[PDB]
Amino acid sequence: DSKVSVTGLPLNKGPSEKIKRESLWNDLKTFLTENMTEESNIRSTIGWNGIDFENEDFCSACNQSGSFLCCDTCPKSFHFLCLDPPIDPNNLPKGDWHCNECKFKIFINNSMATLKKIESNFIKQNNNVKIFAKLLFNIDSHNPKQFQLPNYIKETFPAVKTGSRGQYSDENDKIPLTDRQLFNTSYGQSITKLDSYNPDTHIDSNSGKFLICYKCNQTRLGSWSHPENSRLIMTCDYCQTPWHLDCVPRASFKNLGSKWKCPLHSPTKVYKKIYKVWKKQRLINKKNQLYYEPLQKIGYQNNGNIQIIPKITQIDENSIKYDFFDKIYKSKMVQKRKLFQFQESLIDKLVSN
Amino acid sequence: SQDILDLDDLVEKVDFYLGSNKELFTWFKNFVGYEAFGPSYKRLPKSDTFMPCSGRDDMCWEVLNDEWVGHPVWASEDSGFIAHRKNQYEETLFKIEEERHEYDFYIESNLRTIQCLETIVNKIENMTENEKANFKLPPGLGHTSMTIYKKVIRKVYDKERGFEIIDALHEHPAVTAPVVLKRLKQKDEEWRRAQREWNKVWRELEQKVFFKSLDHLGLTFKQADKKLLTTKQLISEISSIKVDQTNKKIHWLTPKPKSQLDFDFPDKNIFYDILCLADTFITHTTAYSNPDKERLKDLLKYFISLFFSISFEKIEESLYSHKQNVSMSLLDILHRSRYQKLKRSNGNLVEEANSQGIIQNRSIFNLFANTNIYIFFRHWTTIYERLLEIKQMNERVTKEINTRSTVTFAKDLDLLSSQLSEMGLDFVGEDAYKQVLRLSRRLINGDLEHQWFEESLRQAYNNKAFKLYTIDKVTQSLVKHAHTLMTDAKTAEIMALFVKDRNASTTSAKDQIIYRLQVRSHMSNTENMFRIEFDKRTLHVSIQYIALDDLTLKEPKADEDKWKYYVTSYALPHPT
Amino acid sequence: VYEATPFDPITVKPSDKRRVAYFYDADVGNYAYGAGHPMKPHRIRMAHSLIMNYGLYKKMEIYRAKPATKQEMCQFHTDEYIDFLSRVTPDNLEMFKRESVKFNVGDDCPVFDGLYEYCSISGGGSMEGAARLNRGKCDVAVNYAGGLHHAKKSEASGFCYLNDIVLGIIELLRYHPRVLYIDIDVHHGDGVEEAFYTTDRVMTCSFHKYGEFFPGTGELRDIGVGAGKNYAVNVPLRDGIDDATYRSVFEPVIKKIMEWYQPSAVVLQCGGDSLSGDRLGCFNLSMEGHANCVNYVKSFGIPMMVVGGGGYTMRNVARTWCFETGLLNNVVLDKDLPYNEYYEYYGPDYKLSVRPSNMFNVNTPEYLDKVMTNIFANLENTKYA
Amino acid sequence: XXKXX
Amino acid sequence: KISLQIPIKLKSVLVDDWEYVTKDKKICRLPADVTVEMVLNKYEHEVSQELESPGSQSQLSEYCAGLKLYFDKCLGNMLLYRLERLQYDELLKKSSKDQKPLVPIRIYGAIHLLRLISVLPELISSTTMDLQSCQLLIKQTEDFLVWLLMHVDEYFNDKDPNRSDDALYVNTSSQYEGVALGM
Ligand SMILES: [K+]
Ligand SMILES: [K+]
Ligand SMILES: [Zn+2]
Ligand SMILES: [Zn+2]
Ligand SMILES: [Zn+2]
Ligand SMILES: [Zn+2]
Ligand SMILES: [Zn+2]
């Protein structure tokens, strides 16, 4: 029938000479079945019956890709939910669809003396809220948008960056993998999962010595006449402390989603379970982060938002020492006197009998 | 301290800081007085869990879960799912299986509908013209499926005409069933003939790449073995073991760990095997002149006869029994003038510390070496361990290969590839180890290709014997290092000191210190040093990396031995 | 508490003679997902041929379960999703562009032909298989067309459109108090774990590969919520695991589960993409290291239900399934294949064995120590059945 | 992402 | 150009909300427990007793009425992220079904009022107002912002939808995310 299939040629055709050259060197018992299968309908539920321009390739509102309803007058295109009001993709009114801006233009007949007229009349009518008059008149000339924070708000926090499609990123995003486009190409079986080669993953890149795991205090480099003794060292993304995969019970190398964080950072969110929430702020840089050094040391509380020196409270190791010891001592003695009073009350209640 | 963290959370966090210290962590435990908990699921509000779900009875609401939800787009953090590598020959196999499956799918569907049309035709002809004029088929043709015959007839009959022909079949099959049956018949036979003509080529291509697809460590070995068998790696290994020993014995409670490397040589014929390989390479190669060749041969011979204390007569009898079937001291060669003339002729403290502890009938010998001798010895141990691996697989693999149950039903139909056999590379009931050694000798001689050596070593054993693909380069490097051990002057002097000491029958700590000072006299003050210790009673070897301030013997356990050794070292004016 | 072990051969138990029932519908093999997708219902046909040429039909009963109805499918899934599945076709697909994005049935899982019928065959086989286990009237129930453990309640994922393991377990729960579900695929059985995540009547236990691997669920710390806490066991492993390591991990966990949970029925999903030389899997099991799990689960002697699963190379899956069924019938089959219709797929040796690679194994003993210690610490709290 | 096709 | 000063606590509230509706895939719980009408009515009823002169009261009432009208007219047009337009469509549907028009001030909470406030300077600078009127609007908005900062602990709690209940945010299913974003 002459149409090529997966094999390269028509189905009613043997192999070509090129394939057979570069690919060469130079009664049964399931006849049965329609005799042994007998249907099963033993189940419990058997009772159940059962200007010739073209529009843009992106949404004018969210600036992303998809299936667009387009406008004929102007090259704008919108998603269906990205309109005002959103349109049902099935029940689409055919006829001439225009956007808000072109509809405003055709309504005013592209005459702005009439814009003067209607806006003056509008501001005369909306006498109750005269401050919001002109504002309330401009909203009707704009095609819809989506919300994006003003840039004077995003730039108060410097660890915050707008992602690709206007998404949130906060320094815990590892990065997209650029030479992992180079990874689809790769070096042959020299994988990005870090297998089969760990002689130079146990060696400090810059200094030259070995990376020693924090928990076991060894760099088990193994010996590559016996590769079953290596132990897959990995370093934290924040403090660069090295850990074995068998010590932090992880079984993976974090490569794509976020940065891996050592067990040696305190929290960033608590859930006290008593339940209450954070004791950790955001990093308000721009050199508006003001510090305070309290004049009293052994009682100041102020937050879980301290900074340790040799609003952010500046505190030193001595005050932390004293506060820890004080808290545990007084909690100790208070719980002991509570048990004392309970047990003595118990004895006078029991001898009362 | 500010009542934000719970007590057990604090203790669990401090466990990640002082966990490996038992004293401090127990003191902390004793002094301090000691919801979605899974990362993968989210709780939806009880306003999204209201869908009809008709067939659910009262138990299906009690048992099934409708609130907690996971999905592989936010468990991947919106960017993830790496995939396995699947080397090239696996891809070649995948495409062959795809073509096979395509042909089988089409053929089998065509026949599944051909049998149904056959039975409806043989039932439809048995009528009189009345019923034939009134006959019609229900949707499904009396079978259990409704879409098979539709798919087949549309694929065969130009889908537009396929639709009109199928609804005509549904309307009056008395006239259209025969022609559809005929077309199905002829296209069946056509596809089947093409399928067998394609089955020949698929078998030979798959016969070449099946075994090559199954070794993920042998396709990358010749390039990972010249990068990882250098000097820097072999020294980094022992350095890392050393720093591990020290860094972890800082933990005082653990017993002291001794020297860095330990090797054992249970078989004594692999030495003659390696000697035969090295001799073959020397006799073939053109890099050295004939003097250099015989000097290298004798150097290797007497070095292995000296270090491991194997008698020269046993060596000669071993190579006798070897080569008849194929149908002075080392210092004489160290200062090569000797060998050329040869083959041309053809108070109270120190004293009583010295008095008790004399080792007579010495069995533990020491060799203080620089990097040259260490690297030579390490190449030797590498070849030994590889040959020993295959010699230990030998008996099971030969018992397996001699009893291969080849089915003659696949013998006659050309279904088995004899291309490895007609050239004599299949391991017939000969020995496996001897055949491997003979093949490697032919490869070193340059009379056997690399591809066929590797294919033999795949098929015969498994993809388990891949470490022999570089058996010629390791011998190249071995002979090169054995030449280095006699070109240099410093290493020549070191090996001469080793000969003089090994030939000596009795020693003491004083003589060991004198010998260490003697050998360090030749090499610089920045050189590394190794102690290679041979224990003869069990044929064991231990390698110790010497930090310049090392105790040149192994650490004792008693005050007596330790302190008397260093106070008898106090006798010599060398620094402490 | 892990300890290394060797791998001794498989020897059947002469006492445990079970009346096995086998479900096969001769139509399932003719529905193909697409040109080049790695899912073939042809691998279920191949297997059957082997099973019939070894003479295993004289040993068990062969049935053909009547296929599920749209209202026995909706015992788990929703009416809108089942209606979409029943209505959609490759030609009218352009008319369903809003439900192709809601229900995820466009491209990873495509619309190909007779999709509703493949799902009906799978579900009917498994519900019927489980229903014959309750009526007292089998001991093992084999059904290889099932095992679509990825489908969610109102979404398809992972080439799976209908979750029939859940329908089978619901049919089992009508007579058995506690049910155990073991999953030895290379992936995570996320649909079966989600459907029974807050219940203490089904205990799911899955051994999978965890990393940046599909579907990315199933960490060691997913143990359930609500009344079904500690009744979900996830064993994550690394690449290249072998027969002896998998055995030393599999047998203690399952023995502990059976000792503390004490299930009344088992459901073992024996999908074979955890074999060596697969297109998507990364493990290094052989045929016998894959059938040892089935033999061990059969050891305990309670009503069992074996279903199929993944498997992307057709010959490996066919041979492993034939061997597993053979040892379920208390025979170890010959290693020389008989002449069957698909004889030429099994080159070049033409034997019943699947070979492992020399791939490097990265599952160290200390990692498995930690994992098994955590798992046993959790399981300590499910004792009083 | 997903499983292949 | 116009400039408005927002307390940094409300800026962090807005950044948190931007983090939730974006890569956390959460929406708001509607109808809110405290809507825009309730916040503005409480504010006006609490401040109208503060200063005596009638002009302050007239200005306050006019500002609150205009803010109500403007939020009503602006919410669907410009104040919604892309994930939250399916919610808007479903509310619009279930409103048109009951023959009742949607009135957004009685449904949406204070975070959307905060969005409107933050975006106000650009909308002001895009019109042709006076300068006196722009600075009057900015003064009124800054006074409202300090009043709201005094009550921030009452409208903007953190409660983990995944943990107990009744937080100001809710999780979305994969069907909602499939039809909303990737459609
Ligand atoms: K699994
Ligand atoms: K469960
Ligand atoms: Zn859009
Ligand atoms: Zn327009
Ligand atoms: Zn470690
Ligand atoms: Zn860290
Ligand atoms: Zn799978």
UniProtKB/Swiss-Prot annotation, chain A:
The keyword Metal-binding applies. This is Transcriptional regulatory protein RCO1. It is found in: Nucleus. Catalytic component of the RPD3C(S) histone deacetylase complex responsible for the deacetylation of lysine residues on the N-terminal part of the core histones (H2A, H2B, H3 and H4). Histone deacetylation gives a tag for epigenetic repression and plays an important role in transcriptional regulation, cell cycle progression, DNA damage response, osmotic stress response and developmental events. Transmembrane segments: none annotated. GO terms for cellular component: histone deacetylase complex; nucleus; Rpd3S complex. Keywords: Acetylation, Chromatin regulator, Metal-binding, Nucleus, Phosphoprotein, Repeat, Repressor, Transcription, Transcription regulation, Zinc, Zinc-finger. Component of the RPD3C(S) complex composed of at least EAF3, RCO1, RPD3, SIN3, and UME1. Present with 486 molecules/cell in log phase SD medium. Its main location: nucleus. The lineage of its organism: Eukaryota, Fungi, Dikarya, Ascomycota, Saccharomycotina. A zinc finger (PHD-type) spans 56-105, 210-268. The keyword Transferase does not apply. GO terms for biological process: negative regulation of antisense RNA transcription; negative regulation of transcription by RNA polymerase II; nucleosome assembly; positive regulation of transcription by RNA polymerase II; regulation of DNA-templated DNA replication initiation; regulation of transcription by RNA polymerase II; transcription elongation by RNA polymerase II. One of its GO terms (molecular function) is zinc ion binding.
From Swiss-Prot, chain B:
Disulfide bonds: none annotated. It comes from the Eukaryota. It is found in: Nucleus. Catalytic component of the RPD3 histone deacetylase complexes RPD3C(L) and RPD3C(S) responsible for the deacetylation of lysine residues on the N-terminal part of the core histones (H2A, H2B, H3 and H4). Histone deacetylation gives a tag for epigenetic repression and plays an important role in transcriptional regulation, cell cycle progression and developmental events. SIN3 also has a RPD3 independent function required for normal longevity. Present with 1660 molecules/cell in log phase SD medium. Component of the RPD3C(L) complex composed of at least ASH1, CTI6, DEP1, PHO23, RPD3, RXT2, RXT3, SAP30, SDS3, SIN3, UME1 and UME6. Component of the RPD3C(S) complex composed of at least EAF3, RCO1, RPD3, SIN3, and UME1. Interacts with ESS1 and STB1. This is Transcriptional regulatory protein SIN3. It comes from Saccharomyces cerevisiae (strain ATCC 204508 / S288c) (Baker's yeast).
From Swiss-Prot, chain C:
GO terms for cellular component: cytoplasm; histone deacetylase complex; nuclear periphery; nucleus; Rpd3L complex; Rpd3L-Expanded complex; Rpd3S complex; Sin3-type complex. The keyword Transcription applies. InterPro entries: HDAC_PDAC (IPR050284), His_deacetylse (IPR000286), His_deacetylse_1 (IPR003084), His_deacetylse_dom (IPR023801), His_deacetylse_dom_sf (IPR037138), Ureohydrolase_dom_sf (IPR023696). Changing residue 324 to A: Strongly reduces HDAC activity. Belongs to the histone deacetylase family. HD type 1 subfamily. Residues 18-330 are annotated as: Histone deacetylase. It holds the Pfam family Hist_deacetyl. Changing residue 150 to A: Impairs histone deacetylase activity and transcription repression. GO terms for molecular function: histone deacetylase activity; histone deacetylase activity, hydrolytic mechanism; transcription coactivator activity; transcription corepressor activity. Keywords: Chromatin regulator, Cytoplasm, Hydrolase, Nucleus, Phosphoprotein, Repressor, Transcription, Transcription regulation. Component of the RPD3C(L) complex composed of at least ASH1, CTI6, DEP1, PHO23, RPD3, RXT2, RXT3, SAP30, SDS3, SIN3, UME1 and UME6. Component of the RPD3C(S) complex composed of at least EAF3, RCO1, RPD3, SIN3, and UME1. Interacts with cyclophilins CPR1, CPR6 and CPR7, with the kinase HOG1, and with ESS1, CYC8 and HAC1. It comes from Saccharomyces cerevisiae (strain ATCC 204508 / S288c). Its EC number is 3.5.1.98. Changing residue 321 to A: Strongly reduces HDAC activity. Present with 3850 molecules/cell in log phase SD medium. A motif (ESA1-RPD3 motif) lies at residues 319-339.
Curated annotation (Swiss-Prot), chain E:
It is found in: Nucleus. Coiled coil: none annotated. Component of the NuA4 histone acetyltransferase complex composed of at least ACT1, ARP4, YAF9, VID21, SWC4, EAF3, EAF5, EAF6, EAF7, EPL1, ESA1, TRA1 and YNG2. It comes from the Eukaryota. This is Chromatin modification-related protein EAF3. Present with 1890 molecules/cell in log phase SD medium. It comes from Saccharomyces cerevisiae (strain ATCC 204508 / S288c). Residues 1-181 form the MRG domain. Belongs to the MRG family. Component of the NuA4 histone acetyltransferase complex which is involved in transcriptional activation of selected genes principally by acetylation of nucleosomal histone H4 and H2A. The NuA4 complex is also involved in DNA repair. The gene is EAF3.
